Design a binder for this molecule. Sequence first.
Ligand SMILES: Cc1cc2nc3c(=O)[nH]c(=O)nc-3n(C[C@H](O)[C@H](O)[C@H](O)COP(=O)(O)OP(=O)(O)OC[C@H]3O[C@@H](n4cnc5c(N)ncnc54)[C@H](O)[C@@H]3O)c2cc1C
Length: 450
Amino acid sequence: QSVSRAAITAAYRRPETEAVSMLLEQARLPQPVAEQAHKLAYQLADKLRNQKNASGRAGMGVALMCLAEALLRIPDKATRDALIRKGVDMAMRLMGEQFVTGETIAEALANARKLEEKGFRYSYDMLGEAALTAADAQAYMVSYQQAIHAIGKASNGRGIYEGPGISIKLSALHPRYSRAQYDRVMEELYPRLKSLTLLARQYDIGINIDAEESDRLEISLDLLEKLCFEPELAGWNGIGFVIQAYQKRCPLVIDYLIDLATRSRRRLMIRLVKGAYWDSEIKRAQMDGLEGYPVYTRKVYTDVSYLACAKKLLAVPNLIYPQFATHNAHTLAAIYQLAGQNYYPGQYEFQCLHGMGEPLYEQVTGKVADGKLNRPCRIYAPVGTHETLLAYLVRRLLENGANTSFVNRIADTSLPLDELVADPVTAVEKLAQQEGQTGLPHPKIPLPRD
Ligand SMILES: Cc1cc2nc3c(=O)[nH]c(=O)nc-3n(C[C@H](O)[C@H](O)[C@H](O)COP(=O)(O)OP(=O)(O)OC[C@H]3O[C@@H](n4cnc5c(N)ncnc54)[C@H](O)[C@@H]3O)c2cc1C
């Protein structure tokens, strides 16, 4: 292929100067919106850093304190004045626990209530991906079936917005998905996706297809296309799909999705993310030796792409329920403002990962009289034992450990608040004036052919 599909194909690896130049005006916050976004972002990030006065205590060497402490333990003021494989497995489960909501779906669900009463929602992720065998994919299938039964019974008619949903990885459902051919995916994967989706619809819970590696985008769109035209799914708006703003294709995938929601007569649930596989995408493209990268190479370009994509999503509320997944205070503030006045619950939600967004979103989800923004947030809740945790944990380490990540820069007491929440468009134009051209690739990431 259609007009919208062909345009996705042709954007696959377009030069960054071109891709970034085209996004800029789509991403620019109008003057007054930009300033309310800055102020809100500043406030959120200020509260985050300085929850337990962490920066005001910088406002106030160590051996002296130990002596002042021992002196303060003198009870009477007068007296005082007068005076390899195992290490890896272990470190994985130790660092990883903070990102896991429970080992079983029942355990995760039984803990649902605490944050659900505060206005939080949930999307449960049965950990495990990249099925290597036919038996592996069968077992993931039954784990997903089981989870939908338990989630749906706990949802108990609350429906797709207020009630819990499930997130699935297509790589879990087909052996060797990474190299699978179109014909085998449709024969084998598609009937399992269709079956899980029919089940979710019986319980009226959301079912989201997670986005994985970029060379799987095209087959996931073929699967989505077919799925949206199932008679048993007519009139039901529970299908969800993730799109990754670090991809050059993202804006064009949105044109496609908008046309699909129209033709298939539904409102799609669309989770907009930046993306979780950047380091691997860069390595992969450098080994393939093709004309360029399917993702941006500077983090600020991804931020620009996200804002442009968020605007496009918010413009079509009859066709799309946008789910804005982020832990970045500026991104959140910019969305809040871009969504305009006269919020209604079913306009959009925020999303965050378990063990990562709680402090940001404790300022967001809840009553205005308690100082909150009163916007719903859906927590993505990984569920599994130690044997399913590895790949997810490594992605979290890369996310938390990168110096370009907001969750890393916020902990840096030396980087000032204004720089942390600086506007990405303005950042890009600043690079452009310094370097001579808009959207130049990262200086340390040359094209694969160089
Ligand atoms: C609820 C939820 C669900 C998610 N589901 C998925 C999913 O299905 N598939 C998926 O891929 N991701 C998914 N993610 C996103 C991913 O796991 C990270 O959480 C997310 O990208 C972090 O973005 P941020 O705005 O929180 O952080 P920010 O710190 O503002 O931006 C972080 C990031 O920018 C990108 N980046 C980093 N360096 C560069 C660079 N040099 N050049 C270009 N881009 C760069 C990467 O996307 C990286 O995560 C999900 C996130 C959430 C909250």
